């Protein structure tokens, strides 16, 4: 939902 | 919980700090009108930016472009390029002190809010104001874009937090919820990175947590313990924690689920005005009466 969570944490 | 300070500047009162998202830099904006760019790994001053008279309270970097924006007591919202070091243009419209200015994460927009009781949205390509959000009955001390949805949240000395629907923009920009609860003016408001939660902080010495759904929003709980005006508050992005910062000269950490005190950090002589977290690191920064600190927790 925020940039870091979406790009780094989740995928 | 322990605080590990990595960088400190010694200066006159600082009001705003912004982390660069990929360089080891912070911008700091001071009550004397000057803006500084510091490298917190070398501990060195990289640049000075002077384009305002009187305090500069708002400061933010664009998340991917070599721009930053500053907002001043001179009513100006200034946009700068940090590679060319030039002031690019100045957005005219506000009629009293600008309290906060930030960039949207996707659209070419800047948000600012002001003692003139308005929040403004600007398009930084056309250099025009594209919306004036009115409804607060006193200074708007803070505004922030939602991290994913077309919403804005704002906080005012009129004692309300308001959530605004800007999907029409993207009436059109309209208040969705008026959140009453604080019995004094509200100084700050913030969204959680991923959950439908809002945090606000006021002159009542309280931090409040709110939850929203598509149809309604309500007060969840309250962090009690500051003994003076709370200036700023945020959600810890990687732990279930709330951080707050206050004129009582403390930074406090609280449990997100229970709202209980976890840790207090205190400075002997300095009121705190602002705190921020780095968008990609577990690094925090605080501005106070004697400068700025960058620190880790535990």
Q: For residue B103, what are the β-bridge partners? A: B110
Cβ B279–A3 below 8 Å, yes or no? yes
> Does residue B249 come out as left (phi exceeding 0), alpha (psi in the -120 to 50 range) or beta?
left
Taking the CB of residue B133, how many other CB atoms lie within 10 A of it? 24
Whether chain B has a CB inside 8 Å of the CB on A8: the answer is yes
Q: B62, B103, B147, B283: best mutation site toward chain A, by most A Cβ within 10 Å? A: B147
Per the CB < 8 A criterion, the answer to whether B149 and B158 are in contact is no
CA B167/CA B148 separation, integer angstroms: 12
The residue with tokens 């305002």 is: B52
Domain ranges of chain B: 1-298
CB contact burial B54-89 (16+ within 10 A = b; e otherwise): ebbbbbbbbbeeebbbbbbbbbbbbbbebeeeebee
> Quick one: which of B217, B204, B278 has its CA closest to B247?
B204
What does each C-alpha distance from B143 to B21, B82, B196, B292 come to in angstroms?
20, 24, 16, 22
Torsion (CA) B288, B289, B293, B297 in degrees, nearest 10: -50
Per the CB < 8 A criterion, the answer to whether B284 and B292 are in contact is no
**CB atoms < 10 A from the CB of B195, how many?**
12
CB B267 within 8 A of CB B273: no
Sheet holding B291-297, edge to edge: B3-10, B291-297, B284-288, B272-277
Whether residue B247 contacts residue B229, with contact meaning beta carbons closer than 8 Å, is answered with yes
Contact B268, B225 (CB under 8 A): no
Give the strand pairing for B272-277 and B261-266. Answer: unpaired
SS3 B168: coil
- What residues of B are in contact with residue A4 (Cβ under 8 Å)? 193, 237, 279-280
Q: What is the CATH number of domain B1-298?
A: 2.130.10.10
Cβ neighbours of B248 (radius 10 Å): 18
Cβ proximity of A1 and A10 under 8 Å: no
């Amino acid at each position: 939902a925020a940039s870091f969570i979406d790009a780094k944490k989740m995928p | 919980m322990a605080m590990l300070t990595k960088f400190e500047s010694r200066s006159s009162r600082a009001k705003g700090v912004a982390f660069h998202p990929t360089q080891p830099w912070i911008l700091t904006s001071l009550h004397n009108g000057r803006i500084q760019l510091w490298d917190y790994r070398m501990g060195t001053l990289l640049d000075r930016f002077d384009g305002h008279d009187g305090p500069v309270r708002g400061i933010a970097f664009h998340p991917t472009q070599p721009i930053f924006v500053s907002g001043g007591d001179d009513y100006k919202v200034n946009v700068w390029n940090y590679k060319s070091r030039k002031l690019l243009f100045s957005l005219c419209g506000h009629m009293d002190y600008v309290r906060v200015c930030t960039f949207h994460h996707e659209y070419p927009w800047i948000l600012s809010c002001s003692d003139d009781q308005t929040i403004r949205i600007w398009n930084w390509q056309s250099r025009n104001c594209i919306a004036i959000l009115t409804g607060h009955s006193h200074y708007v001390m803070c505004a922030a874009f939602h991290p994913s949805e077309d919403l804005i949240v704002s906080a005012s000395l009129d004692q309300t937090v308001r959530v605004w629907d800007i999907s029409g923009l993207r009436a059109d920009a309209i208040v969705k919820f008026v959140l009453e609860g604080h019995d004094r003016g509200v100084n700050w408001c913030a969204f959680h990175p991923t959950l439908p939660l809002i945090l606000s902080a006021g002159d009542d010495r309280l931090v409040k947590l709110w939850r929203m759904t598509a149809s309604k929003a309500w007060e969840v709980d309250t962090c009690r313990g500051h003994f003076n005006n709370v200036s700023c508050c945020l959600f810890h992005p990687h732990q279930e924690l709330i951080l707050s910062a206050s004129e009582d000269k403390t930074i406090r950490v609280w449990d997100l689920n229970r709202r209980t005190a976890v840790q207090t950090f205190r400075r002997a002589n300095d009121r705190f005005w602002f705190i921020t977290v780095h968008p990609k690191l577990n690094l925090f920064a605080a501005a106070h009466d004697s400068g700025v600190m960058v620190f880790k927790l535990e």
